[PDB]
């Protein structure tokens, strides 16, 4: 891991190896970005914690014993990626890297539409999958929109001439996540 779902409180940890030390360690957490830049999230030293203004309310930091915690209060898609904790005791610095996976559970949709030209005999049925990180749709046989929340949507069309071979099944996946949509009958 560590894996978090969208909206979840989640925690990254780091520690100092000398168990008797704790407040003495200068701790700083960074979000790593494209492709080597490190962006300071916040600092802690002697139980004084300052979170940089851009991350304020999104991240917090606290200590337990020799153990240091990065709390991301509500995981959003931007939080998916690597993190670096820098621990410093006077001249000595030790570094810890940590990856966070943010996941948006998939939504699968199905709806149909009959044709209007040249006649009403063709049914095209549409299956849509929105997820993060890897939405994937397909029709079982007899265009990547990027959303405001950072998630991805994909859609496939299937066209049935008369007479319609119903039921038809769509398969939606994230990674190991799987759902099916089945169109059983039209309205008439």
């Amino acid at each position: 891991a560590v894996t978090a779902f969208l909206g979840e409180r989640v925690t990254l940890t780091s520690y100092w190896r000398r168990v008797s030390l704790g407040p003495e360690i200068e701790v700083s957490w960074f979000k790593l970005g494209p492709g080597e830049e490190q962006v300071l999230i916040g600092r802690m030293h002697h139980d004084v914690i300052f979170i940089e203004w851009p991350f304020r309310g999104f991240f917090d930091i606290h200590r337990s014993a020799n153990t240091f915690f990065l709390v991301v209060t509500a995981a959003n898609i931007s939080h998916d990626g690597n993190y670096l904790c820098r621990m410093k005791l006077g001249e000595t610095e030790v570094t810890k890297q940590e990856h966070l996976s943010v996941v948006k559970p998939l939504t699968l949709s199905v709806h149909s539409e009959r044709s209007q030209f040249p006649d009403f005999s063709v049914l095209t049925v549409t299956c849509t999958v929105n997820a993060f990180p890897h939405p994937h749709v397909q029709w079982l046989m007899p265009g990547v929109m990027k959303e405001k929340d950072g998630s991805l949507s994909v859609a496939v069309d299937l066209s049935l001439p008369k007479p319609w071979h119903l039921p038809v099944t769509c398969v939606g996946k994230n990674d190991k996540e799987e759902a099916h949509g089945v169109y059983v009958s039209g309205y008439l």
Partner: protein
Amino acid sequence: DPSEYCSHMIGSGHLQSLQRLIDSQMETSCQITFEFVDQEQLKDPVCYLKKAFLLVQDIMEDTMRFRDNTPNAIAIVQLQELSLRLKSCFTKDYEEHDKACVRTFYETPLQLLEKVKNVFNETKNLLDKDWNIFSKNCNNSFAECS
């Protein structure tokens, strides 16, 4: 209801047992919260100890827990029994002052132990000078808290 006997209850054996509790604790940066007497509010040495002592029994039971028949567990058993004996030596002050002069600390177990060792130690020393010392009327000092 205090008497000469009070001068003879806290032995140096008790105090060595408290030092053994201290010396035997592993060093971590671990902290715990406990309630104790505010030394910033009770400055008076006699009254401080009178107050500390009315807390020390519950403090022990809730904060100083060891596995049974272990040397440190036995030491706590003997410090508990000592505290029953010393009851006689403290005269009661107004009940209105039961929750006064008290403070929470977020400190190391070693720091908790040291506070406790100091109560016993200063209580011993005061009592060595004057078996009647803790019959002092501490109602005023308590009232000055906060």
